[PDB]
Amino acid sequence: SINQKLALVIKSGKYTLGYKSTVKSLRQGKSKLIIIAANTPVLRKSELEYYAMLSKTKVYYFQGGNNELGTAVGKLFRVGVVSILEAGDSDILTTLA
Amino acid sequence: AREITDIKQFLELTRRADVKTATVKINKKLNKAGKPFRQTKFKVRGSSSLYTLVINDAGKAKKLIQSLPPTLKVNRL
Amino acid sequence: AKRTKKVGITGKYGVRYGSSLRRQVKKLEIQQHARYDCSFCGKKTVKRGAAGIWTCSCCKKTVAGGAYTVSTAAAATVRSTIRRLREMVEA
Amino acid sequence: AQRVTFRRRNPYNTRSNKIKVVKTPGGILRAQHVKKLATRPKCGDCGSALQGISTLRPRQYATVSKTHKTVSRAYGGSRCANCVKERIIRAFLIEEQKIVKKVVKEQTEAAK
Amino acid sequence: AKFLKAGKVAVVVRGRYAGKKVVIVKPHDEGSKSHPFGHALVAGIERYPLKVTKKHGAKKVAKRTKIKPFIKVVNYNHLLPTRYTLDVEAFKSVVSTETFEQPSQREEAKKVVKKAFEERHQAGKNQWFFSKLRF
Amino acid sequence: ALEKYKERIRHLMETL
Amino acid sequence: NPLTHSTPKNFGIGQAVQPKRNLSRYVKW
RNA sequence: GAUGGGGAAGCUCCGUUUCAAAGGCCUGAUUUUAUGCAGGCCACCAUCGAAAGGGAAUCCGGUUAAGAUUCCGGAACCUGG
RNA sequence: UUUACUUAUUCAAUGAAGCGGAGCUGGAUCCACGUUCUAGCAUUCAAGGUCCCAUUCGGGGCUGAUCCGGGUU
Ligand SMILES: [Mg+2]
Ligand SMILES: [Mg+2]
Ligand SMILES: [Mg+2]
Ligand SMILES: [Mg+2]
Ligand SMILES: [Mg+2]
Ligand SMILES: [Zn+2]
Ligand SMILES: [Zn+2]
């Protein structure tokens, strides 16, 4: 599942959590996929989508809020957006997600 | 009331058109709780505000008194 | 260390008004003073300002709701019914 | 031990009749009437106090310069920096989305 | 990959020039001793030209087509990049790290930028760049 | 001078 | 004329402010 | 609590913006018919009602038989031009 | 008697602003395909298009914005 792929990325790949680090990765071109929580405000989501369009980065819309996204990435805190910097062990980039 | 610290500004204030009167006041004070010394306050009476220049040097104060304009009405002590 | 065996928040009323009325008031007072999750920012920071008005301390979002709870069962049923009708109209 | 009196003919403790006790150069205590304190101006979008704006009674704002009542930014004064930033972002993104939607609608009309 | 290259048009979101459109003349990803952060040397428009119609005469059009530029070093977090591009070959030499340090080579740099922007606007290029953002 | 400026602007329109 | 542009106005519902029109039929005489 | 209106034999009553043509501003050498004002714009209601509500700005020292943040001396501030 | 009509009379609202009919108007009897991810913005006889002027700082006409009605809704 998508949660299993995220857990595999957490245990094997490179990732960053949070809007500011995600934007820095997008600006530097190091990002490869961004997961956006469902309760993210629409202006924030639009800015992330515009940055992803500029940097040619894939966008996935997580079915769940920031609490669920934090649980899925294995943290005890809420996360609004997750940027995957390197996922070679996981198949998340090559799949539909 | 305003306090001035620039000597050129004080001279310009003394030569200002609306200025007619000045006052020279002498105080006996203590510097760093030591020996007595003499402090001189020059007060120029403007139309809106009164300007005060404070000088702690007796010789410089005497020189400034000599350098005051002659048409200015000076009230000593 | 529980200080009261059963009255709870209704200990401020003492021995007055009757026990059944005190229980009835206790349930709704716990509901109205509880803290609720914000549907926008995802935090448990929503409290009642006045009856029917629920504000989130973070993100400053104000939602209309029930007198002593954020969402009533009737409102949830109305929401589901309106969603079904809208889906039928679009389809 | 020195007791004081109101200096005006209002004998009641109203919001406009507040006093403080001050010692004069004459060596005596005397009442001194205090004006009501000013309220900081608020943002028009979020309601927070505006940074860099002087806090005065509304008539007193006519006596100060434009520096004390503004900041050097668009909506300086009336709105705060974060709200101005958010509305700039919203304006740009919505205009871009409008262009995108118009192009998509024209393509859909052509294909339909 | 990277989109914050020379010639990229961005919108300033913080500072005195907030809400105004600039073009990146020189990016700096690694910062410097001064401004120890990713930043960009940009040239933008402080005062946008007014709209002109068919009925306006030569003097009125000349008055309404005036452009006041500015040059700025700005943090990346204070810029919102766009998808538009603008040629920076005409003022690439005058906007540099040493331009800002010396008072006042900024005046000569802004004269060059003003002349380039006014000539391009009279030519009619970059309508979105020369259009004021309404917010 | 005005004619020369118009010619320069037209040339910039062509070449830009 | 490169300086002039066509900016049509949308006078539909929920759009730009309605222009002046002859309301002689609706005059309260 | 008047006016516009509407009741009442009537002294007067209702009502307070309606049910009213309820008043201000801009431009003009208006293609000239020759000494006659043309083209436009914006709109809602009198007045009374607080010496404790709201509100521009002043203090110190001295002075009288009895005045005093008001007079006198000194030093300020507001409003309008 | 039954069934209609509006013009007296009655009720309500408004900024008396979009009512009724028709379009060799368009798309498919119905619609305006001018507005629905977003706490932005929308105002100076409206820009543009086209006929003139006497070109000169600009000024007029049609259109943009279909027509008709002897009923403000
Ligand atoms: Mg009456
Ligand atoms: Mg009165
Ligand atoms: Mg009072
Ligand atoms: Mg007395
Ligand atoms: Mg006096
Ligand atoms: Zn919240
Ligand atoms: Zn704000």
d(CA E60, CA G5): 17
Instruction: Reduce the secondary structure of chain E to three states and give it as a string.
Output: CCCCCCCEEEEECCCCCCCCEEEEEEEECCCCCCCCCCEEEEEEEEECCCCCCCCCCHHHHHHHCCCEEEEEEEEHHHEEEEEEECCCCCCCCCCCHHHHHCCCHHHHHHHHHHHHHHHHHHHCCCHHHHCCCCC
CA B51 to ligand 5 center in whole angstroms? 21
Strand order in the sheet with E8-12: E68-75, E39-47, E21-28, E8-12, E79-85
* Count of other CB atoms within 10 angstroms of residue D103: 10
The angle formed by the CA atoms of residues A84, A87 and A93, to the nearest 5 degrees, is 80
Q: Cβ of D74 and E134 within 8 Å?
A: no
Phi then psi for residue D99, to 5 deg, are: -60, -45
β pairing state of B21-30 and C53-56: unpaired
- The upper half-sphere exposure of residue D24, i.e. CA atoms within 13 Å in the direction of its Cβ, equals 8
Peptide bond preceding C71: is omega within 30 degrees of 0, i.e. cis?
no
The two three-digit tokens of residue E77, written as one number: 């977090």
Computed from CA positions of residues C47, C50, C52, C53, in that sequence, does the dihedral angle turn out positive or negative? negative
In total, how many domains does chain B have? 1
For tokens 């859909």, what's the residue? Answer: D108
Does nucleic acid strand H have an atom less than 7 angstroms from the CB of D35?
yes
> Where would I find the H helices in B5-70?
7-14, 58-67
- The upper half-sphere exposure of residue A11, i.e. CA atoms within 13 Å in the direction of its Cβ, equals 10
Does nucleic acid strand I have an atom less than 7 angstroms from the CB of G21?
yes
User: Neighbours of D (≥3 Cβ pairs closer than 8 A)?
Assistant: A, E
Q: Which residues neighbour ligand 6 (ion) by CB within 5 Å?
A: C 38, 40-41, 56, 58-59, 61
d(CA E99, CA E95): 6
d(CA E121, CA A88): 49
d(CA D39, CA B38): 47
- Residues of D with CB below 8 A from A43's CB? 86, 89-90, 93
Phi then psi for residue E44, to 5 deg, are: -135, -170
Q: Cβ of E18 and D84 within 8 Å?
A: yes
The neighbouring-strand residues paired with E44 are E22, E70
d(CA A82, CA A60): 10
Range of the domain at B10: 1-77
d(CA C37, CA C58): 11
Q: How far does the CA of G24 sit from the C1' of H36, in Å?
A: 28
Going by C-alpha positions, the residue among B43, B65, B63, B38 that lies closest to residue B53 is B43
For tokens 């009309």, what's the residue? Answer: D109
d(CA D81, CA E13): 9
Asked if residue C16 lies in contact with residue C32, where contact means CB atoms within 8 angstroms, the answer is no
Topology (CATH) of A1-97:
60s Ribosomal Protein L30; Chain: A; (3.30.1330)
What lies within 8 Å, CB to CB, of C71 at 6+ separation is: C65
Going by C-alpha positions, the residue among E46, E47, E40, E43 that lies closest to residue E23 is E43
State how far the alpha carbon of F11 is from the alpha carbons of E62, E113, E120, E123, F6, in Å. Answer: 19, 19, 11, 9, 9
Asked if residue D88 lies in contact with residue E135, where contact means CB atoms within 8 angstroms, the answer is yes
The resolution, in Å, is 2.4
Asked if residue A59 lies in contact with residue A52, where contact means CB atoms within 8 angstroms, the answer is yes
Computed from CA positions of residues A54, A55, A60, A66, in that sequence, does the dihedral angle turn out positive or negative? negative
